[PDB]
Design a protein around this ligand. Sequence first.
Ligand code: SAM
Ligand code: SAM
Ligand code: ZN
Ligand code: ZN
Lengths: 387, 387
Amino acid sequence: MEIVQEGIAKIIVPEIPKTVSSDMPVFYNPRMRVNRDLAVLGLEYLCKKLGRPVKVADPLSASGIRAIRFLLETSCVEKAYANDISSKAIEIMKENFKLNNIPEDRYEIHGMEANFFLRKEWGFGFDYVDLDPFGTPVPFIESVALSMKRGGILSLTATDTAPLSGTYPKTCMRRYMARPLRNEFKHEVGIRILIKKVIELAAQYDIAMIPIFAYSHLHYFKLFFVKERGVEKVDKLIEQFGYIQYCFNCMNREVVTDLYKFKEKCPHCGSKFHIGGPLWIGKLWDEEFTNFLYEEAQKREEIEKETKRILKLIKEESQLQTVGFYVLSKLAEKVKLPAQPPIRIAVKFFNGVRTHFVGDGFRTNLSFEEVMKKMEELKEKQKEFLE
Amino acid sequence: MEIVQEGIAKIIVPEIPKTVSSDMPVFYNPRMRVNRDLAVLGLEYLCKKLGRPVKVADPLSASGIRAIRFLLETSCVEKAYANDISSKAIEIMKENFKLNNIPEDRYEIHGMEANFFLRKEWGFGFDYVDLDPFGTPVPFIESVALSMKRGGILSLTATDTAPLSGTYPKTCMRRYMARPLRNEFKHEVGIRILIKKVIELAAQYDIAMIPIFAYSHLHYFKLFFVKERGVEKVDKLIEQFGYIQYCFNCMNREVVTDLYKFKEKCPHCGSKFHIGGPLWIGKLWDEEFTNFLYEEAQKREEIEKETKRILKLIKEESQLQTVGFYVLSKLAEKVKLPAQPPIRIAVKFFNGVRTHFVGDGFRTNLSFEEVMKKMEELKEKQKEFLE
Ligand SMILES: C[S@@+](CC[C@H](N)C(=O)[O-])C[C@H]1O[C@@H](n2cnc3c(N)ncnc32)[C@H](O)[C@@H]1O
Ligand SMILES: C[S@@+](CC[C@H](N)C(=O)[O-])C[C@H]1O[C@@H](n2cnc3c(N)ncnc32)[C@H](O)[C@@H]1O
Ligand SMILES: [Zn+2]
Ligand SMILES: [Zn+2]
């Protein structure tokens, strides 16, 4: 019904409403542009890492845009294996592959259920897999992990952020076996929960799915994993499962990996100290991988400017990684700060960095008490220099 | 190589070593007789419950003994679907089905990978599924749950009892995400961990796998589940996940479902209070289901005498269900009891019942302190009446 261009690719897709949500359940969503940009860059990383032709998988292909962009915008794709259980998805995929002048022997199209497609006896493992489902990726995790080759990378997407973010706690518990926290850094909590789920599902088969990148935007999470083998690597991941105690009254938070160490009352104001998790308390970004994404993105004109700005902010953020973060407006609302300095400036007072999660959010190695102390200080010297 | 008879069935199987373990990794193991007896009785229960023809599945069939015994020893089996990825397993299966004069339209034989076999578009759900793998059943749980029909029953077996029982804690953590306890009731802890794993895997799809029967013998666990639907039923199951704090010094134990309530030191002697779980702290036996198994077993001459004795002991045990149990010899060794009365008699002093888990084990509603008090009393009045 409509032809659109994304990057180097041209595709035929059904017409799209005047406006769409970030997680719009449609055949093709242009608002997922950044997501697909990251996927392309992620594959190019693997290309530079392996230095050889790779086989990539697109189990939930829809229009086939990702597989196509992989073939056109990267250098090492030997063959792309795209799949979709939908018939017209198949038809549209066929026509899109031909529309982009892609040689037949460069790709395969399948109309199987994702898990069947992945668990096929290929005789080889996928170097790169992009899992982009409507809602939760849980039903496909195990099949993906098993189908992937050692050292391979998983490009993952999840749009069921509502349960993960604490809006639907019971739903979150059933699917991810964890208690979410609907706070100012709820999106990070959700991501860390998703990561924990992915790791434990793969851990069942002694497969180590190491998280190397995380990105949250509106109603979708974007994750990157690298598959490794060995029970010791799985163990090292499990050791990085933990809990987050959070206080809704004063926003105090602490990481707990020892079951004996839970506190009922918030040490600061004495309010209820809620428990989030279990979840991933490790690093959200691999410095090298993130840095590559940013540098490689700057070399590509077909990469969205937004993707580049996001990658710059995430690079800055990855150099000071913490569990949870602070939101300036929430802190200021707590201490009634006379004037709120721009977040770029505000972070300096806390020796911290900006976070992509929230506009006025920031990470810092300072303790909660130290942060509040900084707020009071800034508050006092602002009132003091105001006569 | 050898023909053997079990129940009403006659089968051809490769010759078996003079002696075998309970979990012997062989084509056919006669030591699993009791297990298959329970499976048959379990199916007959469903027959009496539904009152209609049912479709049963045997994803890991091997010799095809289970599917055959189902067809021959129950009344409601419409069609049996047996499967095995092994070629000679297939060949042997074919010949065994024909050997027992089973009509072709009464069964189907497949040579697919279990998950593929179960996830096939059958156009119907299985009323009864028997999962009997070498080692852990984890890799098949989700496929089984999805393939089963609402109200259907799962006949499950697990031979990886070593990790579940605490012999290999790190291995247990990777596969079941839980800390085992290598104590006197380690086998119950293992079963409860397995149950928790099964429930959470099915919970991912809003499927409620309710445990209705548990049996531990040597190096294998036997479980029965009934599939139900609705998020509320899944929630009620999740609420029954918990932890077991245990003390290796004095054998004190307590159930903890509240993360805030963990104790570092054993309240009795002050030694380290270890933590087992998370795991299933609910009932291990459905009274009605268990009672049927016992009564129906007594009507069948082709059912092992051992199976009948076990079912009688388990029926007795199911009327006083607790989390964990006590072992007389261990308690006596702690207080140095002059003479140990037979377990049948000993249980009376504690107002408890015998447990199938261990010969001299027993369950009781008395608190740990009360139990030890009983031991000292019995000890004193035994020494007192001894002049
Ligand atoms: C969220 S869309 C992904 C679109 C595409 N990956 C992109 O980036 O634009 C997911 C697609 O997977 C297909 N799908 C959903 N469930 C599936 C399943 N169980 N097996 C195979 N394909 C499935 C649907 O038809 C849907 O079009
Ligand atoms: C433990 S034996 C079960 C024997 C039989 N159920 C009984 O009670 O005597 C498991 C069988 O499943 C088969 N099997 C193992 N892995 C499989 C898989 N991934 N897919 C299909 N069959 C499998 C093996 O060939 C093996 O013979
Ligand atoms: Zn507080
Ligand atoms: Zn103690």
